[PDB]
Amino acid sequence: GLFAHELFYSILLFDLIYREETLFNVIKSVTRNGRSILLTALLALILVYLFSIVGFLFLKDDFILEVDRLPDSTERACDTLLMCIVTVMNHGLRNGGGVGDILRKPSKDESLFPARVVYDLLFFFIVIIIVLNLIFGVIIDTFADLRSE
Amino acid sequence: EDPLAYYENHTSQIEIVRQDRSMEQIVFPVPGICQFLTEETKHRLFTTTEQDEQGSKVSDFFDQSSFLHNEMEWQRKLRSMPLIYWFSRRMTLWGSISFNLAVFINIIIAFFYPYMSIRPLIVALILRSIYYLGIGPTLNILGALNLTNKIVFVVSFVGNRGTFIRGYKAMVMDMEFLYHVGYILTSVLGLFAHELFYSILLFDLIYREETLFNVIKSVTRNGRSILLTALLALILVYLFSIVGFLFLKDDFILEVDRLPDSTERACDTLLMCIVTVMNHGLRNGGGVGDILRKPSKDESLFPARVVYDLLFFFIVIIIVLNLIFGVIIDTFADLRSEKQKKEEILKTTCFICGLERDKFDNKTVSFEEHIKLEHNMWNYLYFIVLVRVKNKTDYTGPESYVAQMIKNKNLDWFPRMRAMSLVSNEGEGEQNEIR
Amino acid sequence: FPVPGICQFLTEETKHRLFTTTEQDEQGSKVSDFFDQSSFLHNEMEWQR
Numbered sequence: 001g002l003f004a005h006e007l008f009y010s011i012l013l014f015d016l017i018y019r020e021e022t023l024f025n026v027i028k029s030v031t032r033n034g035r036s037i038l039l040t041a042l043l044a045l046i047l048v049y050l051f052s053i054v055g056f057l058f059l060k061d062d063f064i065l066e067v068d069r070l071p072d073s074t075e076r077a078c079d080t081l082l083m084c085i086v087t088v089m090n091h092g093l094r095n096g097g098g099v100g101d102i103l104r105k106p107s108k109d110e111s112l113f114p115a116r117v118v119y120d121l122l123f124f125f126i127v128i129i130i131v132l133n134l135i136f137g138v139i140i141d142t143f144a145d146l147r148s149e
Numbered sequence: 150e151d152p153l154a155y156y157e158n159h160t161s162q163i164e165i166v167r168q169d170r171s172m173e174q175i176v177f178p179v180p181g182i183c184q185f186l187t188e189e190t191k192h193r194l195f196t197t198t199e200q201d202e203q204g205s206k207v208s209d210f211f212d213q214s215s216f217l218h219n220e221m222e223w224q225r226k227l228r229s230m231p232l233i234y235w236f237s238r239r240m241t242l243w244g245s246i247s248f249n250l251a252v253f254i255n256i257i258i259a260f261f262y263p264y265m266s267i268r269p270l271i272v273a274l275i276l277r278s279i280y281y282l283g284i285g286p287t288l289n290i291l292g293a294l295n296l297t298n299k300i301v302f303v304v305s306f307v308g309n310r311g312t313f314i315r316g317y318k319a320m321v322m323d324m325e326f327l328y329h330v331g332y333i334l335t336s337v338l339g340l341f342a343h344e345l346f347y348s349i350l351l352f353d354l355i356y357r358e359e360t361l362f363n364v365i366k367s368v369t370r371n372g373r374s375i376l377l378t379a380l381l382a383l384i385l386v387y388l389f390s391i392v393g394f395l396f397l398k399d400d401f402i403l404e405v406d407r408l409p410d411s412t413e414r415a416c417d418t419l420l421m422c423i424v425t426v427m428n429h430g431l432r433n434g435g436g437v438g439d440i441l442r443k444p445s446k447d448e449s450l451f452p453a454r455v456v457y458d459l460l461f462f463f464i465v466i467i468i469v470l471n472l473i474f475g476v477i478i479d480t481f482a483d484l485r486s487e488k489q490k491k492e493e494i495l496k497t498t499c500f501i502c503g504l505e506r507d508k509f510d511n512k513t514v515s516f517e518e519h520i521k522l523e524h525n526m527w528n529y530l531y532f533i534v535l536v537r538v539k540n541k542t543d544y545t546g547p548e549s550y551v552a553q554m555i556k557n558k559n560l561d562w563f564p565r566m567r568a569m570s571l572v573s574n575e576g577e578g579e580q581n582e583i584r
Numbered sequence: 585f586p587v588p589g590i591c592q593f594l595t596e597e598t599k600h601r602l603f604t605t606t607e608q609d610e611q612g613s614k615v616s617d618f619f620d621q622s623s624f625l626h627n628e629m630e631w632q633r
């Protein structure tokens with residue numbers, strides 16, 4: 001920080017954790033069972049992979065994302081399986097509704113509308129409602145275990 | 150080399166209670182067959198037996214004694230066979246190889262599809278194969294290797310576990326064997342039907358890691374409660390959709406991106422309105438109000454819309470969706486408490502008699518010595534095996550009594566809440582003083 | 585017994601750390617950890633002097 005660049009001093013802020021015991025305990029609430037959290041994240045990734053496979057096999061067209069290109073306004077994000085997996089894992093996980101929010105809105109006249117509805121409901125109930133809540137439940141359980149100990 | 154050492158190794162001691170409720174010590178020779186019991190089965194029996202209603206673990210061990218003897222016989226027979234024994238001894242290696250192959254295959258398909266420690270070394274070899282032969286041939290080779298490793302692993306598993314000893318019906322009953330068969334079928338499908346099927350093998354991670362299995366149990370333990378809560382949410386959504394269709398049909402206007410009007414009414418029919426609510430309102434944080442057309446204060450029904458939106462947000466979204474999470478947290482807490490209680494009982498009590506460790510403090514015989522020598526359960530298993538194998542004409546007094554109790558399906562011969570070292574010395578001293 | 589002079593050099597922070605850090609063994613006694621740390625405590629007394 002003194003020589004290389006002034007920004008490096010920001011790292012020293014982490015020393016707060018060392019100084020305060022309460023913050024250290026709060027962090028231990030996560031670090032104590034970090035393996036469980038990582039395994040839950042891997043399970044979420046596997047579920048996202050399966051959902052992306054299903055979408056690429058059947059729902060390739062609906063994966064249209066608007067792009068603000070620097071100086072077409074939409075792009076297909078399911079041409080390749082890897083790109084579809086990335087799009088799902090990013091948008092669906094970062095969106096409260098799920099992957100359905102980014103997907104093109106279907107019309108009741110469309111023959112595949114019930115399939116889209118079922119897919120969106122399954123993704124919301126499985127990937128978002130449970131696993132993301134499972135991580136929080138693990139954190140709460142770790143808190144309780146630490147307090148009891 | 151040392152006669153005393155050999156005699157000590159092959160001699161066991163147990164404690165029994167006669168019909169007169171008097172403790173007695175029996176010293177017997179260890180049957181040779183008992184030497185064939187594997188350590189994995191011993192650990193499984195120790196860490197799996199569950200306390201009965203009375204709180205004693207004796208009944209489960211007595212029930213499993215026969216299966217333990219059969220497993221000893223099977224292990225001796227297997228040891229008679231060198232190659233099959235060697236294959237069985239390395240089941241974990243085969244499982245690890247299969248898991249790594251499946252993970253690498255899944256990574257390759259995910260990264261490249263559509264197309265057309267030693268682990269770093271395997272990764273380098275796989276990368277070289279991909280660069281040289283291409284994605285297709287490398288995936289085919291990896292799938293063939295995975296299939297071969299899986300058949301070897303299944304053979305080793307059936308050999309080591311000896312589930313066939315119980316019976317073919319028993320082997321079919323076992324869930325692990327069926328899971329392995331399904332894994333083999335999925336691997337075959339991936340090799341032949343389509344490369345995507347290999348993704349299913351990723352689920353094997355749950356089987357490999359115990360922490361992930363416990364996390365999933367956090368949901369599976371009370372899945373019925375979660376499903377009933379979801380059904381209650383569906384009923385509430387149905388009632389809200391009925392109300393909306395009866396009164397708020399117009400506000401249900403949804404924009405649609407038709408493939409090559411920009412808005413459509415989604416409440417013309419009750420079923421369509423129910424679907425629209427159950428999808429958008431549940432998937433939207435705000436609730437059903439977010440999709441509904443924005444009302445204007447000038448409109449006469451604006452207060453009704455405000456009340457409807459607030460009720461939907463406070464009832465359907467705030468509570469029920471939070472009720473599911475609360476159920477999950479409660480299940481987590483219950484599982485943690487159960488595990489803690491089981492661990493404490495296992496590490497602070499005697500398996501055979503249930504006496505607490507604190508009872509043995511400040512005494513000649515410590516709890517560690519008591520469990521190790523005086524009240525070892527493996528000694529009881531060996532004695533049961535000896536009684537079964539030994540000829541009736543050669544039965545001694547205590548052996549005859551134990552055989553009669555076993556035949557009569559009785560279990561009082563096991564000592565319960567009684568240790569000779571604990572109280573016999575003090576009782577003898579008191580009796581001497583009284584005399 | 586008489587208290588050795590070296591023992592007077594033990595610092596209070598180390599005493600508090602030992603009291604609040606020792607963990608019960610399998611038998612449930614804290615004696616073993618204190619016995620193990622006795623040598624380090626003596627060395628710390630020498631260093632403090």
Ligand SMILES: Nc1ncnc2c1ncn2[C@@H]1O[C@H](COP(=O)(O)OP(=O)(O)OP(=O)(O)O)[C@@H](O)[C@H]1O
Nearest residue numbers: 195498499500501502519520521522524525526527
């Ligand atoms: N009745 C019992 N109550 C509690 N723990 C028990 C009981 N019987 C056995 N154990 C424990 O189960 C394990 C079995 O002990 P065991 O005597 O088989 O040990 P080992 O070292 O494998 O044997 P050895 O060295 O005598 O060949 C040990 O952890 C022992 O403490």
Ligand SMILES: [Zn+2]
Nearest residue numbers: 499501502524
């Ligand atoms: Zn005992």
